[PDB]
Amino acid sequence: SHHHHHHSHMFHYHERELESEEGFMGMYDRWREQHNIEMRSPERFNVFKYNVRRIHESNKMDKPYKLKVNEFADMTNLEFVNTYANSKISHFQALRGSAPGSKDFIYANVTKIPDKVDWREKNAVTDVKGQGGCGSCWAFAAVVALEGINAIRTGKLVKFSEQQLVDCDMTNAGCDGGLMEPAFTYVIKHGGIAPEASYPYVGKRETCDKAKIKDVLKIDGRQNVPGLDEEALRKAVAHQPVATGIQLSGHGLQFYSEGVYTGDCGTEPNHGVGIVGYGENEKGIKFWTVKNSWGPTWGEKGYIHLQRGARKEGLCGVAMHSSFPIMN
């Protein structure tokens, strides 16, 4: 639309299909076929119409991001969040760790950092993975940061094992959730992390198998980024990918397709992610580039650009509990 000035794997539909039950049923059957969904019912059709109407209405608003009628269109946001964003980061942080913002931060004294950073362009980021229903986002987030530090130093990009963390790290709660900081402690104290090729992901906690732990990446330390400080977070991201918690609730996040996400978001992280970059789009909107673990069909081939500088806690609580491994 002419008057829109904040903007500039996709399911196509015509607005006319929303005007009748027949058009909506035809759209629903076409959506099911394109996403390889066989399951249909009056209730799922009802959820589909509710979500599509919200997606359609959201896309008529002037904002720098778009939503798409993805494969999660027949899920209510409550079912979606309970299945895919249930790693309990804020919950375990309150039970185990410190409030956000509280040896010193290794990047504290850095003054000169680039305006734009994209670790994907520097062979420090592996392909997007799929976590499934398992509340193991803390292990995926820790692994993004470990794959990052290893590749920056050695020049060889190796996928590391989330499964080893899920099975072996007894300080965390496996598929029930956990935290990145103790996952890094586990890697330091218990001998290192094996490549994915040696300890593959199964999406459920199994017996810790010592035979699969070989050709390990060893690290020396880890630290938290000083919380509630997006500038301190920018200093750490300029040096390496950072593991952080984010809250991914709301229809805006279930259906996020592209652009800089500036929508509603809470400050109770429930999903671990890796921050692999930052920048500013052509319209002056500052962002973080976040690697998610919902596969390549969600967002921009599995990524989300989140608004940077939105609030003290960062948008979606991105700057509350961030941490990174050290190899000194």
- Domains of the chain by start residue, with CATH: 1-328 (3.90.70.10)
What does DSSP assign to residue 89?
Answer: H
Whether 130 and 164 have beta carbons less than 8 Å apart is answered as no
Please tell me the distance from the alpha carbon of residue 9 to that of residue 68, in angstroms, as a whole number: 9
Helix (H, G, I), strand (E, B) or coil at 117: strand
Q: Ramachandran region of residue 295, left (φ > 0), alpha (ψ -120 to 50) or beta?
A: left
Q: Which two tokens stand for residue 103?
A: 């040896």
| Matching residue, tokens 């629903």 | 28
N- to C-terminal Cα separation, the chain: 53
Q: Would you please indicate which residues are annotated as catalytic (active-site) residues?
A: 137, 271, 292
What does DSSP assign to residue 175?
Answer: G
User: Solving technique for this entry?
Assistant: X-ray
Burial of 62 (0-12, 13-18, 19+ CB in 10 A): exposed
Query: Which resolution in angstroms does this entry have?
Result: 2.0
Query: What's the one-letter identity of residue 68?
Result: K
Query: What's the one-letter identity of residue 261?
Result: Y
Closest CA to 145 of 114, 115, 183, 116: 183
Helix (H, G, I), strand (E, B) or coil at 148: helix
Please tell me the distance from the alpha carbon of residue 291 to that of residue 126, in angstroms, as a whole number: 10
Burial of 157 (0-12, 13-18, 19+ CB in 10 A): middle
Whether 257 and 66 have beta carbons less than 8 Å apart is answered as yes
